[PDB]
Structures are given as C-alpha cells and as structure tokens.
C-alpha cells in the first residue's frame, strides 16, 4: 500500500525561540507530497538517514521499536518499549531475541531472553508521530499528539514536532522493527532527506506554516523572497545546468 504525506513531518531544527521572523533553515526533512509505505494491523525497514514514523489507532495496540545495525547478534541496539504504564527505555548492546509482538485483560510478558553487558537504563481517534535521527552518536526523538476522527486516512493539516529526548549512545543504526499488541484467544513510515524550508513563527508560540522551497516554482520564488506572499512580476530564482 502507498499514500501521500501532504504536509507532515516538520520538527524544530534547534531550541532557539524566534518571535516573528520567517526563518529559513537547511536540515533533514520529510519532503512534501511523497509516498508513505503504510501498513495494516511487518518486515524490517532500512534506516538510512532518519525516518518518519506515524500511527493512527483508537486503541493502545501500537508499541515501541527496536533499532540496530546488524539485527543478528552481539551489537549495539536501541530498544524502546511500553507496557500498561511507566514507559521504559532499555538501550544497550545485547543479544536481543526476536520480534516480541505483545499479547493482551492485562497479561503481557513476552519480551526477551538474554542479558549481558548493558550500558544504559531508563524507567519512567488519535494520531501519534515520531522522527528519529542518528547524528554524531546522538539519538534525537520528536513527538506530537493529535486528535482525529477518521482513522482510515492520513489527515490534512500542519503541526510542529516538539523535541522529546536525546541520548548520547554512539551507534550506527541501519534498520529497525516495530511492535504491536495483537490479541490472544496501521502505522505510517516515511524517509527524510536534506532539504530547505521556510518555517514560520508567531511570537506567541510555535511554527504555524512552512514551505518546501524545492518542490515547485512558487516554492523556489517564495524561498528566494523569504516571504509567503508573492507580488505580480518576474523573479530570477536559480540556474539551469
């Protein structure tokens, strides 16, 4: 299956506050209007330079993730999961076993079977989306909650992706896995590339709109003028080689 990611997947390049300047950045973003490879409720997916993960559900069935570089044995591997409550993060080099799909009443225990020289620990009608980046041994996560009414389609709209956490674990992730909670008796995936954007701000809060100034000629023209409004005339944007 395939769908179109209209204007989703926008996070904050840094922690700076900007009142109303219409700022132009250059970083790794999800391109506007691209295919997402949406699934149903799940093989391994390559983690090239960062991914956009989104989920649409009405029940708490979607669960954490597993990352790594070989996904076979004896290597550094992220592992973020979640139980009924108190989200636990377990990020170490170990012999991760398999893909532990969760099995539901509250009786859910099939996670792992191996323990070795761990290095880190942590214990703590809706749309949830995440962005993962692996830069200089830092793992950054951005998250946002959005209430929805339709669940069979990706909604139209804009929302910034406020930063969640960061981890200093040096690792070179290349693939990852996802976890569900199938009972016993729909998640979106997209990749992101180096682009240039025109994030807005409103001096009373956060980003309200953005334009990807590499999509169509108006995007290039707006990006040149550094404004969202273009007056009648002819504008010289770039060069053709």
């Amino acid at each position: 299956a395939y769908t179109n990611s209209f204007t989703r997947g926008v996070y904050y390049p840094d922690k700076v506050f900007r009142s109303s300047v219409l700022h132009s950045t250059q970083d790794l973003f999800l391109p506007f209007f691209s295919n997402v490879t949406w699934f149903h409720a799940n093989p391994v997916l390559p983690f090239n330079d960062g991914v956009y993960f989104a989920s649409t559900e009405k029940s708490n069935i979607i669960r954490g993730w597993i990352f790594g570089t070989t996904l076979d044995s004896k290597t550094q591997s992220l592992l973020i999961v979640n139980n009924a409550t108190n989200v636990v993060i377990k990020v170490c080099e170990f012999q991760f076993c398999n893909d532990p799909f969760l099995g539901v009443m509250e009786s859910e225990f099939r996670v792992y079977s191996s323990a070795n020289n761990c290095t880190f620990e942590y214990v703590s009608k809706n749309l949830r989306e995440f962005v993962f980046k692996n830069i200089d041994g830092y793992f950054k996560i951005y998250s946002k909650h959005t209430p929805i009414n339709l669940v069979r389609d990706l909604p139209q709209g804009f929302s910034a992706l406020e930063p969640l956490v960061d981890l200093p674990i040096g690792i070179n992730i290349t693939r990852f896995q996802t976890l569900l909670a199938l009972h016993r008796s729909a998640y979106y995936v997209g990749y992101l590339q180096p682009r240039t954007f025109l994030l807005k701000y409103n001096e009373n809060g956060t980003i309200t709109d953005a334009v990807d100034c590499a999509l169509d000629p108006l995007s290039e023209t707006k990006c040149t003028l550094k404004s969202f409004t273009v007056e009648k005339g002819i504008y010289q944007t770039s060069n053709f080689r």
Partner: protein, 98 residues
C-alpha cells in the same frame, strides 16, 4: 582509568555556577552562551521548554536561567561617541561635551 572514545563524552565534572545579577553590565555565560549586556526579566514566555531566543539578524537577546526557568532579556552595554562643543579657542575656553 579514564578513556576517550569517538562516542560523545558522558561522565564529566560539575560546573560552579553563581548568583545572577540584574541591571548591570556583566559578562554572562549560560551553558556556553557568552557575551555581555544588561540582564532584565522578560515580558515574554517561550514554551514549556526553549533555551535562548534570537531575533532578526540572529542576535541572542532572550535566555532563560537553568535554575528557575525564568526568561531574561539581553540589552547591549551602553556605547556611543563623545562630541566636543566649542565656541572657538580665540573666543573663550569654555567647553560643553555631548
């Protein structure tokens, strides 16, 4: 036995802070952000978390202290030229300065 790896440093010593001062020309250092200016409390709120606000011409003008989470304002320390007003050396020697 300390060790140095390509992974970012994680175990590092503590940094001695100091009690901030307002309404004076000081040399500030907030988690690397340095410079000088008069410190003043802000009338603006960043977010549930933001470190330092900038503006057009990418100048740092608003930061929050990482002990009380209060946003402060940075204004450049006073500078300007001095001018000498004279009626002429032959006329007199009184001088007014601007």
């Amino acid at each position: 036995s300390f060790e140095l790896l390509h992974a970012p440093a994680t175990v590092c010593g503590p940094k001695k802070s100091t009690n901030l001062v307002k309404n004076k020309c000081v040399n500030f250092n907030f988690n690397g952000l340095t410079g000088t200016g008069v410190l003043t409390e802000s009338n603006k709120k960043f977010l549930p978390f933001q470190q330092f606000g900038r503006d057009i011409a990418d100048t740092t003008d608003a930061v929050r202290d990482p002990q009380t989470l209060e946003i402060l304002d940075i204004t450049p320390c006073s500078f300007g030229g001095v001018s000498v007003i004279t009626p002429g050396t032959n006329t007199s020697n009184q001088v007014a300065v601007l």
